[PDB]
């Protein structure tokens, strides 16, 4: 492989920039997710999110999580088998499944014990 | 794998952010590289770099490539077998082997025909 390379050649090379990310599971396989007016609905049922209270407090009456129905962001109406839908607690500053879609479950390397 | 995951668990997941980068080969296996006063020395011999003239022109008498001996940046005195030492033509704005060390030759996916 190096034999075909010459000094001063301009080359394209591939680099595998692996990275670990930390997010909260909101949807498991089969779940429909909707946010409306800062409230989470999983399969149409409201679910309280106490871990977001501090983030909501900090933004003074403003909405923390933008409204969406899962199918408006992913084109799939439920989390696909083998995948999860994750969202960061720091909603306004988090890149998550709202942006990059579903995460394959077998890429999860650990669970966090939050203290 | 998904069976051990629960809604609202905080998880760590691994993502393989692969990327292609474009740089010029300055050193091939066995080469020693030194820059001194904006001049390249490969195995102690000066080598002219015409492709840098436009970049040197743009910076008004200032030095384009910082001085270094290979062993000061990589701790190895010559490019190791199976590897290459690459540098971007846009020296002052390029992340390259001066920063991340040697690139494995088998990660090169193509050569660029620069026009």
By CATH reckoning, the class of chain A would read Mainly Beta
CATH superfamily of chain A: Umud Fragment, subunit A
For this structure, the CATH topology of chain A is Umud Fragment, subunit A
- Per DSSP, the total helix count of chain A is 3
Strand % of chain A is: 35-45%
Reported for the largest beta sheet of chain A, the result is: 4 strands, antiparallel
Q: Portion of residues in helices of chain A? A: 10-25%
What is the string of helix and strand elements of chain A?
Answer: EEEEHEHEHEE
Number of domains of chain A: 1
**Largest interface, C-beta closer than 8 angstroms, per-chain residues:** A-B, 43 and 43 residues
**Oligomer status:** homodimer
EC number (chains A, B): 3.4.21.89
Domain Peptidase S26 (chains A, B): 1-115
Subcellular location (chains A, B): Cell membrane; Membrane
Keywords (chains A, B): Hydrolase, Membrane, Protease, Transmembrane, Transmembrane helix
Describe, in plain words, how this protein is organized in 3D.
Chains A, B: The active site is at 23. Chains A, B: It is found in: Cell membrane; Membrane. Chains A, B: It comes from Bacillus anthracis. Chains A, B: Keywords: Hydrolase, Membrane, Protease, Transmembrane, Transmembrane helix. Chains A, B: It is a single-pass type II membrane protein. The PDB classes it as hydrolase. The structure is a homodimer of 115-residue chains. Chain A is mainly beta. Chain A has one domain (1-115): Umud Fragment, subunit A (Ribbon). The first copy, chain A, contains three helices and eight strands; from the N terminus they run ββββαβαβαββ. Chain A has helices spanning 53-58, 70-74, 97-100; strands at residues 10-27, 33-36, 39-42, 45-47, 68-69, 83-87, 103-104, 108-112. In chain A, the strands form two sheets. Chain A has a four-stranded antiparallel beta sheet. A three-stranded antiparallel beta sheet of chain A has the order 1-6-7. In chain A, β3 and β4 (45-47) form a beta hairpin. The longest helix of chain A is centred in the middle third of the chain and has 6 residues, at 53-58. Chain A binds chain B through residues 1-2, 5-29, 31, 42, 82-84, 86, 103, 105-112, 114, and chain B through 1-2, 5-29, 31, 42, 82-84, 86, 103, 105-112, 114.
């Amino acid at each position: 492989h190096v034999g075909d390379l010459n000094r001063f050649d301009v080359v394209v090379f591939h680099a595998n920039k692996k990275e670990d990310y930390v997010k909260r599971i909101i949807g498991l396989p089969g779940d429909h997710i909707e946010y409306k007016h800062d409230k989470l609905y999983v399969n149409g049922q409201f679910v309280d999110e106490p871990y977001l209270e501090t983030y909501k407090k900090e933004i003074d009456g403003r909405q923390l999580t933008g409204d969406f129905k899962l199918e408006e962001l992913t084109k799939e109406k439920s989390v696909p088998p083998g995948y999860i839908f994750v969202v960061g607690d720091n909603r306004l500053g988090s890149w998550d499944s709202r942006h990059f879609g579903f995460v394959k479950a077998d890429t999860v390397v650990g669970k966090v014990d939050l203290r």
